[PDB]
Design a protein around this ligand. Structure first.
Ligand SMILES: Nc1ncnc2c1ncn2[C@@H]1O[C@H](COP(=O)(O)OP(=O)(O)OP(=O)(O)O)[C@@H](O)[C@H]1O
Ligand SMILES: Nc1ncnc2c1ncn2[C@@H]1O[C@H](COP(=O)(O)OP(=O)(O)OP(=O)(O)O)[C@@H](O)[C@H]1O
Ligand SMILES: [Zn+2]
Ligand SMILES: [Zn+2]
Lengths: 362, 184, 96, 145, 48
């Protein structure tokens, strides 16, 4: 009975695995079309509403159909990934754990480091009857028994790897066993390795690409509730185009250096805010009228936010946005303050960012 | 040291090879402590020199700050140094490193929770998925799909992966809850 | 300039021996020959350990080679360091 | 054809000054810096358009009240009440602004979304103005090298 | 370009003799052979 069901299921699996990439391209194209349509919302005002500029009148049904199609394509992409690339991940994990068992005795001698999620979770798969399911070497348990059975304990190794002690010997002595009907019930329940499937689900859940595709599906689902969530799918162009990846490699090559440069900029601006708060509070009035003073440096946090938000974005530094120092007894000190701010924060640190990007390219 | 010298100066002697397998254990034990160098000897001829390296010496040399000093020294000699004074600089660096190592030897007097939370959430969510999948409801599914019903088979095929996706969403939510609990 | 200097330091270390200066092409005739030579024969860590051994060892207990190297170190003559030659180059025909 | 059109309208002769690109070897060498990474430059422009579109989505969904570009309070000139209008405003003004869109949109002081809007403006300035333009500069310099 | 030209000038001087053009690898068979050859045998100052 089940032969035809298995054949059809395998046909569908192979179809999705074959068309995995094409469905990803179609999802990207549908997302672009949806966003092109989304460029036509307007706000109408009680609660406000988002209304399409239905010049033709077919934009709303087309958008609804495109949203449904995008969700379906995302689900099919998840299915195709599970059919195509999950087996490679399983093969890699099984190969790695088998080689660690055989050539390092991970669960025999030294144990996982107690902070390695991979090792802690892979402790589950060793007991399973289908441990090298995707890895070709089906003799890994026998090899580990031969290598470590002499000192570490044959029975203990058998318990560790989940293989019976004398089942083969007893069967050779006398088997006297009979088979069971396939169409009868429980023939599928007793033929599935629950522990191995648990380990497989765990590793695929920890897989990064599967998580990204799940996030894609979740955002597509949210796009029906609010249509602007489909804009998040345009971030897939970074992961979809080789040339765009090469361009973004300039930014991502020195990302740690860029983050540390941002931190250094924050620290130096904090020092400048300390100086301004201790000596130049009178110059931070950002009010046109003299009746109500808007002091931006009467509080340390307010002055720091003002500097970060305004002086960094200003072409000439904080001096472009603070009061004129002419005629004051601190005129020279304040001129030095502004000039040094412009030279360090604006001229040098931004130059450091530019040089990091160019050095990444080179 | 005797055996290593004999082996390195008699490279094609099976009679000495047999002694090498006999002394494999002792040689393996002493391998960390045996140091080999080559010198221009008194006879205008290159000679091997074998000496003893202390365990404290090996540890102090493998200390990370000594490694940083070594990297800085290598950078300095390669970039801002010449072949004339290379060995002089090397000897000076060796002396400084030896003094630092000796001083360090004199003065040397003598995460998991979030991993556990993530593992526990994985266990709980996957166990729930297995419980909902493996049930006696197969008879009810058959009673629904007596005949071929390609539509029913495709519906079940899609429902399985939808259940997988929902299980992953539940696992992600559980991980977020655990992270919030541990940080608060 | 900093990146190029780091790359040059890496290359002149991956292609030459720090002690004798013989290129890796000569040593690579034997498989893993360059790394074997740089980690067992001409290890700068081993030279540092030898200097420390000589310094901490009593003068009267030195052997012939130890006394020779110790005198040359006392006079700061670094001719005992192999320069442009090695054990393999000295006994090339005997070994192979 | 352009020379013939130049008799009908004399300003069509200005199009013949583009021949200096095809006439001078040194000018060709200089323009080779631009043309060496032209595909990368075009893709960088596209990425800039996409990220600015994302910023316009955020502004249209959360920061519509700050896009009044009218001096008088009687007649409001809302630049982000329409998605296309907000996208054009961002592309045309914020990219050309020295400090980003925050130079040209309303002051966020005193609002409940002040921190979110400050983050919005700072990230716009860092990504669109500081980084992507730096990507263009680096592409040109890398072509020279 | 200026930095690379300076580096190239340094390298082609540290690796070759200015007079005969024989590389330093040949002369380095004898210890300090290249510097001895360039400062005692083929010194451009000596030729001047
Ligand atoms: N005399 C030498 N001693 C040691 N290594 C040498 C020597 N000459 C050349 N080398 C080369 O140096 C390379 C690595 O040197 P080094 O130990 O400085 O690097 P590393 O990877 O930074 O080391 P560490 O493991 O201490 O961090 C070796 O692969 C070897 O080919
Ligand atoms: N014919 C040559 N004459 C002199 N040096 C040569 C010659 N050929 C190659 N060289 C190399 O030139 C190197 C140094 O040359 P040069 O005297 O120009 O350098 P310098 O350090 O700038 O000198 P100075 O001491 O006059 O400032 C030597 O180490 C040598 O290897
Ligand atoms: Zn060497
Ligand atoms: Zn010469």
């Amino acid at each position: 009975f089940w032969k035809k069901i298995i054949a059809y299921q395998q046909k569908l699996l192979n179809y999705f695995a074959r068309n995995f990439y094409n469905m990803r391209m179609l999802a990207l194209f549908v997302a672009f079309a949806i966003n092109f349509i989304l460029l036509f919302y307007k706000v109408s005002t009680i609660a406000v509403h988002y209304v399409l500029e239905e010049s033709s009148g077919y934009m709303e049904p087309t958008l609804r159909i495109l949203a449904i199609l995008h969700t379906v394509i995302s689900f099919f992409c998840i299915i195709g990934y599970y059919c195509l690339k999950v087996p490679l991940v399983i093969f890699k994990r099984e190969k790695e754990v088998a080689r660690k068992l055989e050539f390092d005795g991970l669960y025999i001698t030294e144990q996982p480091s107690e902070d390695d999620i991979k090792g802690q979770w892979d402790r589950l798969v060793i007991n399973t009857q289908s441990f090298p399911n995707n890895y070709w070497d089906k003799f890994v348990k026998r090899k580990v028994m031969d290598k470590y059975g002499e000192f570490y304990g044959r029975d203990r190794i058998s318990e560790l790897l989940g293989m019976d002690k004398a089942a083969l010997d007893f069967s050779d002595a006398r088997e006297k066993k009979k088979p069971k009907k396939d169409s009868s019930l429980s023939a599928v329940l007793n033929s599935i390795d629950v522990k191995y499937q648990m380990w497989k689900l765990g590793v695929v859940f920890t897989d990064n690409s599967f998580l990204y595709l799940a996030w894609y599906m979740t955002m597509s689902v949210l796009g029906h509730y609010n249509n602007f969530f489909f804009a998040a799918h345009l971030l897939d162009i970074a992961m979809g185009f080789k040339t765009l990846r090469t361009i973004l490699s300039s930014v991502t090559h020195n990302g740690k250096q860029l983050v540390l440069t941002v931190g250094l900029l924050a620290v130096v601006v904090y020092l400048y805010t300390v100086v301004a708060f201790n000596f130049f509070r009178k110059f931070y009035n950002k009010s046109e009228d003299g009746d109500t003073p808007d002091m931006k440096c009467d509080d340390m946090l307010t002055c720091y936010m003002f500097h970060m938000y305004v002086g960094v974005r200003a072409g000439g530094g904080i001096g472009d946005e603070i009061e004129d120092p002419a005629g004051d007894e601190y005129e020279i000190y304040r001129i030095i303050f502004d000039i040094t701010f412009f030279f360090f924060v604006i001229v040098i640190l931004l130059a450091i960012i530019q040089g990091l990007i160019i050095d990444a390219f080179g | 040291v005797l055996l290593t010298n004999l082996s390195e100066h008699m490279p094609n002697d099976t009679r000495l090879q047999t002694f090498l397998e006999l002394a494999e254990s002792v040689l393996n034990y002493f391998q960390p402590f045996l140091g080999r160098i080559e010198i221009m000897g008194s006879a205008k001829r290159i000679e091997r020199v074998y000496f003893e390296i202390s365990e404290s010496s090996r540890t102090q040399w493998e200390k990370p700050q000594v490694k940083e000093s070594k990297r800085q020294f290598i950078f300095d000699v390669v970039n801002e140094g010449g072949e004339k004074e290379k060995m002089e600089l090397f000897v000076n660096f060796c002396e400084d490193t030896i003094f630092e190592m000796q001083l360090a030897a004199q003065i040397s007097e003598s995460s998991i929770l979030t991993v556990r939370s993530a593992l526990f959430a994985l266990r709980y969510n996957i166990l729930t998925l297995m419980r909902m999948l493996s049930l006696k409801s197969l008879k009810k599914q058959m009673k629904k799909v007596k005949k071929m019903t390609v539509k029913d088979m495709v519906t079940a095929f899609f429902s399985s992966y939808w259940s997988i996706f929902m299980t992953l969403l539940h696992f992600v939510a559980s991980v977020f809850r655990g992270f919030f609990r541990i940080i608060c | 300039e900093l990146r190029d200097q780091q790359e040059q330091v890496k290359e002149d270390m991956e292609t030459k021996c720090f002690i004798c200066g013989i290129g890796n092409d000569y040593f690579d005739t034997v498989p893993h020959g360059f790394e074997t030579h740089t980690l067992q024969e001409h290890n700068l860590a081993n030279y540092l350990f030898f200097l420390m051994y000589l310094i901490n060892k009593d003068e009267t207990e030195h052997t012939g080679q130890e006394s020779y190297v110790w005198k040359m170190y006392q006079e700061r003559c670094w001719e005992f360091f192999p320069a442009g030659d090695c054990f393999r180059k000295q006994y090339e025909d005997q070994l192979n």
